[PDB]
Write a protein that binds this ligand. Structure first.
Ligand code: SF4
Ligand code: SF4
Ligand code: SF4
Lengths: 66, 160, 167, 356, 305, 146, 110
């Protein structure tokens, strides 16, 4: 069960959060309904992915002018 | 048959709850707009842009103001009609941005901008100078987190 | 002309204690949750952005405060006394607003009534101005390390009876 | 008889007010409305300020519809000096005043439906404030009323959005009309209150929705020939059901009547921005002039005794809703703590014009 | 070994219900961000630590033991009855011969915490609010335990794992949605209405950790009512129309409790307060007689079984 | 997030002029200010969104000019300076430096930011903690463009 | 109602049964709470001087009805006395609160 636990706690949560990102607007309320059910079922694996956020913000083709 | 009338009232109630549930389920489909943080036209009347050498005489900002807040000291220079203006002190805690002297200026060096991010940590910091009031705020197209704000259009559904 | 602090040392200088202080401060800077406090022209930002008057310590004063409003306001701050502060989100919570000269029944700012961290431009700005204000406040609380839990009560009182004349 | 405090932070959000009641049990029987909370002293400062300086001050009265306050306080000096407004700017003023009446009634029924949600009306309100931004530029803090009309001109996008507002707005209005016929909780939770009739609402002080709730076709701008009201389509609510749902049908019919007025005024276009502007500064005369306009709450009024100076010698305002607040001491006698929320909703009042 | 294997289902269950109340907080925030238009997942723990690290805020009233244990009993009255849920054919906390009956007792000791809250607060506001909250916890208990009784009468068992197995005989139609939809409506209105959620304070002196206790007690009340929606009407782990059966069954019952969370929060946002008179008109003159009515119906119907 | 390193403290004690490129994503900015405050220092605040002539405001006792509401006179008095009075606002001796926390990178003028960074080089106990125009991550670039 | 006070910064009337910091119920015992916000230094001898001055002011200014207007007058000239005491340097500031707004203006070089 430790193999299945690290599988469900490592492979699942970035794909789950990615499906939460890329399907935030492209959804029926049926689709938002099943996504809400999925994110309710799939909560405590998202603890190692909650503070880290890397591929999130570039809605252009900009340059790092900082 | 009073409990039958209670049942008929709840039948009409269940019909209304189902119809209003369809209405609210359709109301939950407001996906494209979603106003939030970024993470208007020229008459925003936000932060007031000021120019120092174009400000010359008539002191109309201290007169048409509803509270008379502007404090500008001036000493007349001889034979050249120069008032020697100094320290254009505007307190935005005193200021309402109600906009009288913005359009009532004879010089019209008072113009408005779109800046409103003046939430500060102290009240004595709000006493601004004439060089702080001459700063171009922001070109809001040129941010990596701000897209085009839906000014002319509405419900574009183009971000997705 | 100011006073002098103590400034002896920082006793909690382990990695675990400063880690817990940083995490508790950042989570304290994350969970604003205001009790709203509208009932004025700055209530209009609430629809774009509890009821127990001792719960929410991170309230911002988004309202036009008057002299008759002031006893209930200082009682409500007595109901939020120790942990957190208030944010002035109105020119009338700062300078008295547009009636700063001639208004008798309106206080010239709550800066003579309550400790205020952040002063706003005042009259209803855009709904992201309150977001920038609570972000600044989060940067302010992030500077705070909970003052190393350092405590003083004055307790000034006269037990002589006043020359009273009630109704 | 446990005394309710009725504190400053109400469980509802309709202003700050004081309604201490003895309430023997849950039946409220005696009302003592204490006011003075949102007070500014408009009269003495208005005596100490000019018209162009108390003209930014007319925003703190009925700020859910700010066109009415500045409209009546600019229509004061227009009829005082007998300066003619051209027909184009006056009709555009009629359009924006009826749009502000629309905004006042929808911003009433928003938090009223929230107490008894926000984005069910904000889908409309974002385009409504887009119309306010295309009309004057501000959200609700406009300063665009002159003696000759609007201070600026209408842009070429605002007339197109005004043409689009009718089939953007009336469809969701009539989708919101059928809810009270469908949903019986409005037929059982706000049904009943408002038991005053017409001969009594004329008797005390009432005007607006509380006077049109009894089936009286009352209108100032129909009796007084003002802004050519008999040209446009009118249907003043003669709904005689009395109660609070009668007031809701009154407000739906007033919004639909304003929709009909604006829809007939979409293609009217009978004429510049400001007529009679030689100089930036002027004065006022000394007459005995009380000017009034059809408020959304009923006969907003401006009393004026002149000084022939830069300052008015007397400036007293008769607000509609503050005279409409007098009837609750009589509409408190046989109701509940669960009823006073519906009462202070159906008064349709904010405390900006109350204390002032 | 003598206590580790016994403690770890309790520990895993406490961690599971903390994650579930995190789900309920951020899921009501997500439905409010859908109907009202990452960092947000940890914002709920930030809420919990904002409510945790605070001031005690004790006034001058001399009811300090009741002031301490008021919100504590309000938490216990939900937390003690999480030993009851058969998430699968295994991983239930106890065998629990009286399954739902202990839940009815622990949910019935909740007005004790409500009256202890109404007396721990030296305020007439929270006094009247504790009276109202205790009275609506009392008032909505009877059709609640009536439809509980009717489902346990269909199953002829009180133990929850037995009724969860018993729902899977006819198949998809064997669930109690198609056996008692009327009693399902009873359990819907009793689940939504009791927790001061579907109609509507009384925390005007409780602050700091006690306000957080009332917070977590209300949302765990929502959690346990939702998990009984799962294990009564929707099914525990059966989708008919080793180790992996437990792992798929916990996903099935969590999808069912997410379904009821979405239905409950949506019905909260689309219904207002019953204004406290139709509330009791419902729970006494309407809801209790029709709960007795479908009790008589299921009593007549179990003769042939 | 939360990369455990005090390299920003090394930058503020080495360069003492760093643009804090950090978003409006909550309070992820004051943690290094809290570590400077826990080191015995004292940190006060400023903002360049309405600060004009910054060297004439931090020194040279810029004027008070109280805003009369049409009732009082001009009363051209001289208020004490910003950072000179802040150096006068250190009553004990254990305070090693004074941190000037600036939180407005826009409306700043590149020339005047270099003038303010040179004013952080004027007093040895002055630390410049300016903003960095709100990048997505937390970047501590030094005053190179200014 | 029950609160009868004119409470500002550094001056709070609070005519209630307050011996210690626990509020109550209301009586003729005016409990002058000073400095709620930790704005100035407020040494104990100077606090005793200001409290004795306020006692002399409420002793010489009574005789009329002690309603709210006398409370406004006595808090107002008590704040004038605190301002003229801090301007002469008897009351320094604090710089230990999170604001330190310098509510009475910066002391000049005069
Ligand atoms: S800016 Fe306006 S008020 Fe100032 S001197 Fe010029 S004309 Fe006069
Ligand atoms: S911006 Fe507005 S308040 Fe300020 S001086 Fe100009 S007109 Fe007066
Ligand atoms: S400053 Fe003006 S808009 Fe803001 S709260 Fe006060 S009166 Fe209202």
């Amino acid at each position: 069960i430790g193999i299945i636990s690290v599988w469900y706690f490592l492979v699942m949560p970035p794909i789950i959060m990615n499906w939460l990102r890329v399907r935030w607007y492209r959804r029926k309320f049926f689709e938002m309904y099943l996504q809400f059910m999925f994110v309710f079922m799939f909560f405590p694996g998202l603890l190692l992915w909650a503070p880290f956020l890397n591929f999130r913000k570039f809605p252009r083709d900009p340059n790092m002018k900082n | 048959t009073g409990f039958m009338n209670y049942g008929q009232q709840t039948l009409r109630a269940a019909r209304y709850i189902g119809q209003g549930f369809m209405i609210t389920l359709s109301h939950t489909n407001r996906l494209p707009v979603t106003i939030q943080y970024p993470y208007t036209s020229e008459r925003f009347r936000g932060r007031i842009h000021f120019e120092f050498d174009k400000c010359i005489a008539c002191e109309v900002c201290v007169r048409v103001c509803p509270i008379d807040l502007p404090v500008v000291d001036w000493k007349l220079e001889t034979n050249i009609r120069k008032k020697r203006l100094l320290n254009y002190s505007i307190d935005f805690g005193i200021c309402i941005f109600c906009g009288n002297c913005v359009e009532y200026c004879p010089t019209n060096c008072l113009s408005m901008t779109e800046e409103y991010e003046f939430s500060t940590y102290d009240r004595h910091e709000l006493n601004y100078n004439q060089i702080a009031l001459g700063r171009l705020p922001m070109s809001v197209i040129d941010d990596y987190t701000i897209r085009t704000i839906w000014n002319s259009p509405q419900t574009k559904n183009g971000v997705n | 002309s100011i006073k002098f602090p103590i400034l002896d040392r920082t006793t909690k200088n382990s990695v675990i204690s400063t880690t817990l202080n940083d995490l508790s401060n950042w989570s304290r800077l994350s969970s604003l949750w205001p009790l709203l406090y509208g009932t004025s022209c700055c209530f209009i930002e609430f629809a774009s952005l509890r009821s127990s008057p001792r719960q929410a310590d991170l309230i911002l004063t988004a309202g036009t405060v008057t002299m008759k409003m002031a006893p209930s306001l200082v009682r409500l701050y007595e109901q939020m006394p120790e942990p957190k502060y208030v944010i002035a989100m109105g020119a009338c919570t700062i300078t008295g607003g547009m009636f700063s000269t001639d208004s008798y029944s309106t206080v010239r700012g709550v800066d003579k009534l309550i400790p205020v961290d952040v002063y706003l431009p005042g009259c209803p700005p855009k709904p992201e101005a309150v977001i920038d204000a609570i972000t600044k406040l989060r940067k302010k609380i992030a500077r705070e390390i909970y003052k190393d839990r350092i405590r003083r009560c004055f307790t000034t009182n006269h037990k002589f009876f006043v020359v009273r004349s009630p109704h | 008889l446990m005394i309710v405090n009725m504190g400053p932070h109400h469980p509802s959000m309709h202003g700050v007010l004081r309604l201490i009641v003895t309430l023997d049990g849950e039946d409220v029987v005696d009302c003592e409305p204490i006011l003075g909370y949102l007070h500014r002293g408009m009269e003495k400062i208005a005596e100490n300020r000019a018209i162009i300086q108390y003209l930014p001050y007319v925003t703190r009265w009925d700020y859910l519809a700010t066109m009415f306050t500045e409209a009546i306080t600019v229509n004061g000096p227009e009829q005082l000096g007998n300066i003619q407004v051209p027909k184009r700017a006056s009709y555009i003023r009629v359009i924006m005043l009826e749009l502000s009446r629309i905004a006042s009634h929808l911003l009433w029924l928003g938090p009223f439906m929230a107490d008894i949600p926000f984005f069910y009306i904000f889908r409309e309100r974002e385009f409504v404030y887009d119309l306010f931004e295309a009309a004057t530029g501000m959200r609700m803090m406009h300063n665009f009323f002159r003696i000759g009309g609007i201070a600026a001109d209408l842009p070429y996008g605002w007339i197109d959005k005004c043409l689009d507002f009718c089939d953007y707005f009336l469809t969701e209005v009539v989708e919101y009309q059928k809810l009270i016929t469908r949903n019986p909780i409005f037929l059982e939770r706000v049904e009943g209150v408002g038991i005053i009739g017409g001969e009594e609402a004329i008797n005390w002080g009432l005007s607006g929705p509380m006077l049109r709730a009894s089936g009286i076709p009352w209108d100032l701008r129909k009796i007084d020939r003002y802004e050519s009201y008999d040209e446009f389509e009118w249907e003043i609510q003669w709904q005689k059901q009395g109660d609070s749902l009668a007031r809701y049908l009154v407000r739906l019919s007033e919004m639909t009547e304003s929709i009909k007025i604006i829809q007939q005024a979409l293609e009217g276009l009978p004429y510049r921005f400001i007529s009679k502007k030689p100089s930036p500064t002027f004065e006022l005369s000394k007459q005995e002039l009380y000017v009034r306009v059809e408020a959304p709450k009923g006969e907003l009024g401006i009393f004026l005794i002149g000084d022939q100076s830069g300052f008015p010698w007397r400036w007293k305002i008769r607000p509609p809703g503050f005279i409409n607040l007098q009837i609750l001491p009589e509409l408190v006698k046989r109701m509940k703590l669960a009823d006073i929320m519906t009462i202070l909703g159906s008064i349709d009042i904010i405390m900006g014009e109350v204390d002032r | 070994y003598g206590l580790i294997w016994i403690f770890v289902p309790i520990f895993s269950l406490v961690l599971g219900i903390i994650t579930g109340v995190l789900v309920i907080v951020w899921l009501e925030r997500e439905i409010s961000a859908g109907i009202q238009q990452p960092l947000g997942i940890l914002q709920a723990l930030a809420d919990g630590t904002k409510l945790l690290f605070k001031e005690n805020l004790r006034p001058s009233r001399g009811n300090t033991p009741l002031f301490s244990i008021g919100p504590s009993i309000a938490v216990i009255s939900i937390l003690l009855s999480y030993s009851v849920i058969p998430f699968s054919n295994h991983l239930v906390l106890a065998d629990l011969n009286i399954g739902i009956f202990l839940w009815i007792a622990i949910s019935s000791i909740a007005p004790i915490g409500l009256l202890m809250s109404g007396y721990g607060s030296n305020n007439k506001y929270s006094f009247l609010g504790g009276l109202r909250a205790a009275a609506q916890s009392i008032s909505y208990e009877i059709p609640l335990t009536l439809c509980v009784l009717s489902i346990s009468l269909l199953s002829n068992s009180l133990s929850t794992v037995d009724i969860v197995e018993a729902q899977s005989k006819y198949g998809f139609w064997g669930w109690n949605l198609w056996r008692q939809p009327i009693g399902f409506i009873i359990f819907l209105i009793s689940s939504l209405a009791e927790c001061e959620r579907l109609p509507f304070g009384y925390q005007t002196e409780y602050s700091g950790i006690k306000f957080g206790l009332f917070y977590v007690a209300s949302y765990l009340n929502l959690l346990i009512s939702s998990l009984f929606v799962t294990v009564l009407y929707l099914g525990g782990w059966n989708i008919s129309i080793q180790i992996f059966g437990t792992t798929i069954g916990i996903f099935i019952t969590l999808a069912k409790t997410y379904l009821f969370l979405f239905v409950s929060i949506a019905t909260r946002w689309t219904l207002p307060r019953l204004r406290m008179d139709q509330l009791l008109n419902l729970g006494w003159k309407f809801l209790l007689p029709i709960s007795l009515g479908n009790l008589l119906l299921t009593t007549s119907f179990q003769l042939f079984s | 997030v939360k990369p455990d390193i005090g390299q920003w403290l090394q930058d503020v004690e080495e360069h003492k002029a760093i643009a804090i490129y950090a978003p409006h994503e909550g309070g992820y900015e004051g943690r290094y200010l809290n570590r400077l405050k826990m080191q015995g220092y004292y940190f006060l605040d400023i903002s360049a969104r309405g600060l004009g002539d910054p060297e004439t405001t931090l020194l040279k006792n810029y004027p008070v000019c109280p805003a009369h509401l049409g009732k009082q006179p001009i009363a051209r008095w001289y208020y004490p300076p910003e950072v000179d009075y802040r150096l006068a606002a250190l009553p004990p001796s254990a305070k090693g430096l004074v941190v000037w926390v600036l939180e407005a990178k826009v409306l700043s003028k590149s020339e005047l930011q270099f003038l303010a960074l040179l004013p952080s080089l004027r007093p040895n106990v002055r630390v410049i903690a300016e903003c960095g125009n709100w990048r997505k991550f937390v970047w501590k670039p030094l005053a190179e463009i200014a | 109602g029950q609160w009868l006070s004119s409470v500002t910064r550094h001056v709070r009337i609070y005519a209630a049964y307050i011996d210690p910091e626990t509020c109550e119920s209301q009586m003729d015992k005016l409990t002058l709470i000073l400095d709620p916000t930790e704005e100035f230094v407020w040494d104990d001898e100077s606090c005793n001087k200001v409290y004795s001055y306020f006692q002399e002011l409420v002793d010489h200014y009574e005789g009329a009805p002690l309603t709210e207007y006398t409370l406004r007058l006595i808090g107002s000239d008590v704040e004038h006395y605190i301002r003229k005491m801090l301007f002469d340097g008897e009351i320094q500031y604090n710089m230990d609160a999170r604001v330190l707004n310098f509510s009475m203006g910066k002391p000049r070089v005069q």
